[PDB]
Amino acid sequence: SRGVNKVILVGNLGQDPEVRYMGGAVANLTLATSESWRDMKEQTEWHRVVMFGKLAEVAGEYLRKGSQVYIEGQLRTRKWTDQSGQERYTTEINVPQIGGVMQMLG
Amino acid sequence: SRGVNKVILVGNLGQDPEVRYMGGAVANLTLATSESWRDMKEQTEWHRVVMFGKLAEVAGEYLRKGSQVYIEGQLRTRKWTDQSGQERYTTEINVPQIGGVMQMLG
């Protein structure tokens, strides 16, 4: 490991977490961070978040469509093909099994 | 204002910073974070970083291709339509001119 790749988020799940398996468990969820402007104009940011193992497993048993959470992980930009067939890029927040934290807040 | 959007990075640039103007000065650069894991794989992450104003113009005079730098900012995913006319999204680490940090290391 050479450099630092850390992202801290406190925000609310926009929708329920989606947990899948392959045989490790994966959980995807989207949280929001807001800020306020006055010319009241808000600005919500959506954060593609993905967790693995127990952390994923816990997210399923307890996280909901409004739950608030603290997340520690690293930026990871992954490539994929769209139906039109061109490799596209989506940047998510990886929450590593060893090194990443998540916590429900309430 | 409402939630916590925070990201911390320590890594080295891949290419000389790109500074332009509008409006106040804007500076784009990309830096690398590397990692190692078993079953030894090296996966370099590349991070689109953008600063404005005082930070930007400083980045120009001092930062070059191999420099190490510390970064504090927030994630920002912006939406845009391309030339062929499909929607695309880009996720950057915005270094707000108010509250964002940058430091050269050595």
Numbering used by the authors:
A (entry chain A), B (entry chain B): 3 to 24, 27 to 43, 49 to 115
Per the authors:
Single-stranded DNA (ssDNA)-binding proteins (SSBs) play a central role in cells by participating in DNA metabolism, including replication, repair, recombination, and replication fork restart. SSBs bind tightly and cooperatively to ssDNA, regardless of sequence, and prevent premature annealing and unwanted nuclease digestion. Most, but not all, bacterial SSBs are active as homotetramers, in which four oligonucleotide/oligosaccharide-binding (OB) folds form a DNA-binding domain. In this study, we determined the crystal structure and examined the size of the ssDNA-binding site of an SSB from Salmonella enterica serovar Typhimurium LT2 (SeSSB), a ubiquitous opportunistic pathogen which is highly resistant to antibiotics.
Two monomers (subunit A and B) of the SeSSB were found in the asymmetric unit. Given that the oligomerization state of bacterial SSBs in solution is tetrameric, the crystallographically related tetramer A-B-A′-B′ is also shown. In both of the subunits, only the N-terminal ssDNA-binding domain (residues 1–115) was ordered and observed. Even in the N-terminal domain, residues in the loops L12 (residues 25–26) and L23 (residues 44–48) were disordered and unobserved. The core of the OB-fold in the SeSSB is made of a six-stranded β-barrel capped by an α-helix. The corresponding residues in the SeSSB are W55, F61, and W89, which may play a similar role to that of EcSSB in ssDNA binding. Hydrogen bonds and salt bridges were formed at the dimer–dimer interface of the SeSSB: S3(A)–Q111(B′), G5(A)–Q111(B′), G5(B)–Q111(A′), Q111(A)–G5(B′), Q111(B)–S3(A′), and Q111(B)–G5(A′). The native molecular mass for SeSSB was approximately four times the mass of the monomer and therefore the SeSSB was a stable tetramer.
